[PDB]
Amino acid sequence: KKSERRLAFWLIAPAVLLMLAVTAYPIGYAVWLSLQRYNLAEPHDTEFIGLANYVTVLTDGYWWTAFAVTLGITVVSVAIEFALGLALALVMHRTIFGKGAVRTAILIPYGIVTVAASYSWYYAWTPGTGYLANLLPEGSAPLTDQLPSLAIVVLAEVWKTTPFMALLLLAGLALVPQDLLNAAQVDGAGPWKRLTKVILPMIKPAILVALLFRTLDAFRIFDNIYILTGGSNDTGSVSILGYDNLFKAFNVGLGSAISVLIFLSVAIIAFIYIKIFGAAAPGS
Amino acid sequence: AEIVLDRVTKSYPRAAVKEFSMTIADGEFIILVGPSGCGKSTTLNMIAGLEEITSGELRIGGERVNEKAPKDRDIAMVFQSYALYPHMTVRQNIAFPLTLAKVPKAEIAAKVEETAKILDLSELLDRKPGQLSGGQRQRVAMGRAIVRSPKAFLMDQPLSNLDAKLRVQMRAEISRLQDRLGTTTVYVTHDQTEAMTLGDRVVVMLAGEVQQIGTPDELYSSPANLFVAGFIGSPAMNFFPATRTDVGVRLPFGEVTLTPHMLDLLDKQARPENIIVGIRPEHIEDSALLDGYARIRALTFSVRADIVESLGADKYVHFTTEGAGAESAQLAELAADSGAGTNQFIARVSADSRVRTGEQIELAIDTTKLSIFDAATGLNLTRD
Amino acid sequence: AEIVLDRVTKSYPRAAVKEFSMTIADGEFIILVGPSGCGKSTTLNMIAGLEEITSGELRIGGERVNEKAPKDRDIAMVFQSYALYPHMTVRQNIAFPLTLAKVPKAEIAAKVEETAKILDLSELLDRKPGQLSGGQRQRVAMGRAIVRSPKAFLMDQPLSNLDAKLRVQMRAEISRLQDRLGTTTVYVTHDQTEAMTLGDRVVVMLAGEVQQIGTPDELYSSPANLFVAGFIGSPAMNFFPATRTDVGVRLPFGEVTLTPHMLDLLDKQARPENIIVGIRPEHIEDSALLDGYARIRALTFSVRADIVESLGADKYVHFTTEGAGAESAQLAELAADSGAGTNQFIARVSADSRVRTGEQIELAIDTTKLSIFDAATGLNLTRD
Amino acid sequence: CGSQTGGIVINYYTPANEEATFKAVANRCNEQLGGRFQIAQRNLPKGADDQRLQLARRLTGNDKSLDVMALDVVWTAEFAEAGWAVPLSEDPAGLAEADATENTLPGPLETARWQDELYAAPITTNTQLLWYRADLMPAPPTTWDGMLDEANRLYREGGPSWIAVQGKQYEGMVVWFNTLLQSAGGQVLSDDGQRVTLTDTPEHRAATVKALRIIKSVATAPGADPSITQTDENTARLALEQGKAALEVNWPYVLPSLLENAVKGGVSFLPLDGDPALQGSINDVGTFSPTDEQFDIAFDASKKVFGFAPYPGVNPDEPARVTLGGLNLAVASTSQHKAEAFEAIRCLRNVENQRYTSIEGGLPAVRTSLYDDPAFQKKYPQYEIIRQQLTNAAVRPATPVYQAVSTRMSATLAPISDIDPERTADELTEAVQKAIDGKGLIP
Amino acid sequence: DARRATWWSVVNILVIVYALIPVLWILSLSLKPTSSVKDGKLIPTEITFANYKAIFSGDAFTSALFNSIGIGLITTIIAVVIGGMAAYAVARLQFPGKQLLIGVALLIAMFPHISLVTPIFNMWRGIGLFDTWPGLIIPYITFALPLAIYTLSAFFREIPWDLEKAAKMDGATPAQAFRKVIAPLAAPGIVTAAILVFIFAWNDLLLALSLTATQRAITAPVAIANFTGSSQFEEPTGSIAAGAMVITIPIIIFVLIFQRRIVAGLTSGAVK
């Protein structure tokens, strides 16, 4: 037909125009801006340097340390989140007592603000004040070290952001008819042999969408490191590096170059997860 | 092999399958039949170890098995919703139990091929269970069950999700298969057509208490209860109350002089004074086509045919006589599903009657096998 | 009221309702029965105005209607999936086509109360159709369909989603209900049982084109096609191939020379080279019980019954043959769904036949209800 | 009902370390202007390089609600060369320069003018001191080696053993290292900040390696603070307040902090709330605000516990050269009305309000006519040391790129527990030089 | 039985403790008196309310709550309207390239904030729009539309549109039918989608931290991230925990009240 299709275009034009006029124009601007020597203190002289604002970022120490830190946090946090969220989903889906209290307890760390969660984890791991650092040996302070500080950031991120992954995995899992498990149980599989040959290959799209969401949302963390470590000890992730280089040095050429490079990193991740491993849309 | 059980029960936090006992022989085809709500699906599950039996024995072979998980007994249940994995291929479905049972993969291929050759899905061993029709879907289910050569092959109303036409062919196919393989089988069902078509015995349950074990012929032509006389219905039985003439029985629209034999079987075993007579729809005919019985040696009457259906070699003639037929042991639950309305009677006349919807009729009843009953106990009085 | 249509059609980017012509009067109860995917539900919609007429007229009593609205076309459909609004209450669900018709609230109360009293859901008038069951939900749907007292009343398989048993009760309900109200009806279904029970005429449709119109008896006992006689009569009437022997017809088990009367009646037209012969299952009577003059003129034969079934008033025996009897012009479309088994037939015998599986039976085929057709065009030669 | 219209309000930005002693001054001067205008008081973070972040984020992205700002002493060059912080010779009247140059100390005032003309009028002149508990140790260290010795002696005895020095990846550590580098003889940048001179000459090389050795002796001494690599100006104050430390080097605003925290509960080695004479001393809003007798009685009992002393030198017979702190009031270049803003920066640094700020806010005062008042020399007891520590001071490089240098040479020393006295010197020279040239990424 | 019941009791208690122990640390720290906060006692002996009696004295944590609520409501209204207009066309209409629009939306819902804040801070949306409400409503809409599209498409595909045909069997008026049969069916899905969008557009820190200066247009996450303490010469742990607890509750109550809707909306209606 043509009437209904023209009406579809008329109904879709608002959202599409809005989204790619306030998501693609910022990136076109950031590119045109990274091609320049644009300091925010003296903006009267911004000459055009071809690509010496990407070389300066890609051949500098502070860029690769931040990239390594954010990749480490991403992979470790996403793995622990997947495991623990599969556990939470199987508990919220197959429990005999009140499964309303459990959904409530799981929605509490989903609606809370990341800033308050990070303050809780910051005061918990401070010696003297915190109960979680008052049980370590004497004179430890596991928040002024690099690797322990990173472990604590991973723990904060896992706690805060596992319930959303759990709910997505449950959205996938509640589409497993009980009959299938009853048949696998008659077949002689057992509790673990079926979790790997009946229920896991069934929720492949839910697992893949949850992994994509988690990987990107962990690649774009700013506050669990802002108000918990601050970026000291060479801990700050790539978002904190962009924030620092834009607002503490005023160089917006380098700030927008870092913006473009982060966008390309996220694009490569979300292209791997899509062209490889499948992971189509949930509305497919 | 040969599955035995006795004294078995269940308890939900209630007597669900209380007081159950039988010895299903090697090849004997038990049909656990009953109305939705009776303990058929749950006694099946119990046999399949999905719920540990509360009290009693569970002897596949001759030994206690009510402790071993379903992974051990080698039962190979089929399900009503065709539980078959979509993420697999038909051959991988069929070979799932066998690949879990540690079979050599060459023998895997050979045996799955023989199983798919027995059935008629032979070429479908590469598609997925999302591009299949109901017949071959349920056939894939049965094929997955066949392969193990199980010990008590037990089904769970597999033909419930199909249409109302392919079920005939599927009944024939299950019968032919079962007769070829030769394995013990128990078959939860929902109607009487299957329970009378495919079966060596029948177990008519009401809410948990078995009412009769017996071959379909003996379950039909000699019921042991009201429920097992009205549940094997076709045109369900017609439950007229009546009186004790002390020479015969006086119907609401007639009076019989039954016989001396049934008379002494009724009198020598005295009972309270309430007798609900039953006359199956086959025996009722139009007096205009017969002379032997319909005369003085029968009970004729007249009624306006509220509706007549000439649906082939048999004209069903309904009629509604006034009075009462309620107030019995279990006819309340019997009529909860069928025979709605306190008075709605059927008569099966031959395919050459002269009637239409809205004129009188002269119906007679062959007073030879009218099945009297009781009310204070419900038990039949013709035979056990 | 009086719905007359002719030469209606349809087109799909396909003439789905090509060559449809009928004249339904007042009070009649027309069925539109056909196999799956046929032109039944589409001609129903086309009557209702949901799919416009591609070519033809639809004068529903007053004037041409094919260019009118649903609010003045044939009113009061009742869908299959029971399209009923969950947020509203049963009261509002029933009263919707009334309140939408600006009828005052007191009269709404009275009319909806009496309509819910026609059925048995009056004490359910306050619930929401999310906490209701299939039977009462069907009752709500038809009760909404009733209140208007419209000109004509067109149903769409309302008894397809119900359970296995309640269908017969709801069938009797629909029959009594249309007998009381008296509205012109069309009723699309998928089976011959209902289409013969509740019906005043029958429209068997295959690929869109009508096959035979008329009284259910006129369709069962006088078919004008292979498809009509292989569709109605649920146990598909047996089929055998043969050719004319210039005196009668010949089979590997019987040599049928019926009569010179039907001989000349067949010779009054052109004699084809490929003839197909059909016998209903209900005309095979087991000479062991045929004590009469029909014992000699029975053309009896013998075969080992592969499977017998005594489901009550009649023993159904199965048996197989040899050769090739899959010659089909409409039998292929028939067996696409049901009718599996190239050599597989069934015979009905009285319940006093001491025959079982594994032995020979003398199946008597009394050649008096024979129906023979042409293998080329399937048209009937004996009757019209 | 209050979109935007109304009487003039002059948003006055200060660090959060003075959100009460400057709200009190804004309240003392508001009611004096009568009906002309009012002086609000917005605040900035506590970090010394985070308030520059906020202030420049408001200045670059044009924020028309920024009128006066209290910027540090090392930001006048970068805030004047960049166009912000309009000079003092730009009024509708033209007398704020006459007001600024009039009475201030020369030390702080010379840190306001960028080339020859002023750009901000000073309001405060900080200077680090040595605070030590007086009942634990007599005769304070007076030398960093003696300081480390005293910490070790108190660790072996089993008391407060920390040192509570501001070692953290922020401007406070560069202040510390600059004091220790100027005392020994070196200096970060040349006179004109054109070339790095940390490790230029073996004299300067020895000075910087000695400063690094002293930075590493602390923070690796046994018994030292477990978290000394994440401490700052505040946590050292509270460290000595809560009894954990027994020495500390920190700005002179710690005496009123200790007095208030004692008289409202807080410390345990100094009750001051069992005294019935201190009741009703604590102000209603929260500050201390004592009488003369109440301050005398809250100081007589804090003179036998918590004496102070001058910053410990780097050699036995060479006094220390501490660095300048302070605040300079400058009127932003994104203010629509900058005659009233200059009147605000002219009536926020009156002689009164300077007595107030200094006496009961800690922050020293820049007016030279106060240090000779006999009541002031009695209520501000650390007027002595501060004075005799502004003579030989150590002003930070004061160049228009200084914050880049101070964010490279504070990440070269990022965890101070693990530095290398001889390797970190060359790492520092390379880092500082690549900051002067301008090429790289800020950590 | 008792074994499985005991195991499930243990698992439920463990999940509840795991999910509540870092929320009852903030509270137990905000109720601890200043003289003894430096005690690792997870249970606050000798509580006192002198840390909440000093957070509201001065409209610094209330105006931020008002700004966050207003921004959330306005971006929720706009995102719901536009995403509904665009999610009714991907749940009922059949136009070419609709399995790509949902993918692109859900992909650019994971856009990283940093790559957006360097150009935005310079744009026309930084030329007289620095810290106002529109300057924050725009990027919040950027990040909130795809959630609205996804949730509303989940909430639309399930309603039966054959009910519309059933309605048009009575009068056939499409306006009255779509208003009285389709609107009361869809409305709760729209309200749940709005709840979810408002919750998701309430906790962002980077954009509201880089594009907000004054007392107007400064959300709550930024007001607490910049919080230093009530008094200037006393330890700020109790005061910062008090501020965090003040900001957290107005959304914890939300999620607790609307849990049955949120769980079913996030799961595309799978669980009920």
Ligand SMILES: OC[C@H]1O[C@H](O[C@H]2O[C@H](CO)[C@@H](O)[C@H](O)[C@H]2O)[C@H](O)[C@@H](O)[C@@H]1O
């Ligand atoms: O006296 C209280 C002040 O302490 C800090 O001020 C110092 O901060 C930097 C060192 O961390 C120095 O550069 C600065 O010159 C010092 O004044 C604090 O930053 C200020 O807010 C206080 O007023």
